[model samples]
Target: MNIFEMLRIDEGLRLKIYKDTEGYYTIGIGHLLTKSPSLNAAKSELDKAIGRACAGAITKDEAEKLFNQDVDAAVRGILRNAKLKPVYDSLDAVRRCALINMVFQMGETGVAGFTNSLRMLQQKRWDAAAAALAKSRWYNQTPNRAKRVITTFRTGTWDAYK
Candidate 1:
């Protein structure tokens, strides 16, 4: 299969792109195949982007765009550029994903106005990022959705499910 196929385009059939994080949109009900996210390929790309940013392979400006784009493109254009612009200061990988997934889920302006969480993450404060993810309108409405993504953001891994 081609890269896009491996990425599960499904010929543009709108998979159940959950309005949540984990940067995914689960598919096939029981299969739980998240939209545009293949575990191996997607994770590989995240690691690569993070590594490149850390190594200065790309400038922080470039990294911001590329990171968001890959995740957005992966999920069929759900992520936004404005939301990703401020990621320049996130020194932590987990926080980076948190920001990426948030922007992907919430759009640019929504994430841009995420003052408290952005401050917490920008300061490299892990617990604060967690709390910020939980204590928000999104969190209030979505329940564990933001918390789960924050957990992955801080914990630096994905969650398994039934």
Candidate 2:
């Protein structure tokens, strides 16, 4: 599947504002309104998406809009990182999606912090990379998601989704 489909399944669709696992005010496919560059503008877009001034339900179309923006931002963020760009470029499509998925769940900075894992990934050491990722607190926080991502990284296939 594509990154959007993968993320939609992982993040889940939320029409209304709610606190994420980390207690950030999030909405519309894991869009963190709390950490938004322009909270006011984000909120305004949310309001417009829901067709009111209140923090209520949002339309699917608008939610997808936010999702696309967030996904693109995650991709750009990864590509912009000097350390990550070459590693990302070395990966195939499926493996690249795995990297993007990690950045989407955690920020690029968070992913970048996994120096050992990045090193393993850069060297095409799938098993070592997966092992390194398994040692993270992020793995503990969401074991199922982590397992899927780890499997994707290890196998370089979308078989994890199955």
Candidate 3:
């Protein structure tokens, strides 16, 4: 599957404001509104849209817009890393989507911290890369999602998506 389709399933759509796994004020497919620079302004816009103060809902259109923005940000974050740039460029579409998916879940810095894993990936050692990731805290926290991403990395195929 494409990154958007995979993310839509992994992140899960939610029109209403709710607490995420990390207790952040999130909405619309994992958009963390609490972390926005202009938190109040963003909340106000949503409040107006949903016609309520807190815990309001947004339209599917709005949610999709937010999801797109978030995905773009994730891609940019991955590209911004000097070390990841070449590796990302060298990957095929499916493998590239797996990398973007990791960045989407864990920020650029978090993904970059996988130095050994990145090195393995750069060397085209798919099994080594998968092993490194499987041993990470990220894997422990979300084994199922991590498994799908790792499988994509190891096989360079969309079998995980299927």
> In model 2, which regions exceed 4 Å deviation?
35-54
lDDT of 2 by residue, 1-162 (tens): 999989888899988777788766678898876655555666776676556785446777878988998899999999999978988999999999999999998898899999999999999999999999999899999999999999999999899896
- Rate residue 122 of model 2 by lDDT: 91
How far is 152's C-alpha from truth in model 2 (Å)?
0.2
User: Better model by TM-score, 1 or 3?
Assistant: 3
Clashing pairs in 3: none
Where model 3 places Cα greater than 4 Å from the true spot, the runs are: 35-55
Encode model 3's per-residue lDDT on 1-162: one tens digit a residue: 689999888889988777677666678887776655455666776776445675467888888988898899998877888977887988888899999998888888888899999989989999989999898889998888899999999999988878
What's the distance in Å from true for residue 144, model 1?
Answer: 2.7
- Estimate, for each residue in 37-112, the C-alpha lDDT of model 1 and write its tens digit: 5554433444464453232123444433543455555334223344444453444544455555555456567777
Positional deviation of 34 in candidate 3, in angstroms?
2.2
- The models' CA-based lDDT, in order, is 0.48, 0.86, 0.84
Error of 1 at 131 (Å): 1.4
lDDT of 3 at 131: 98
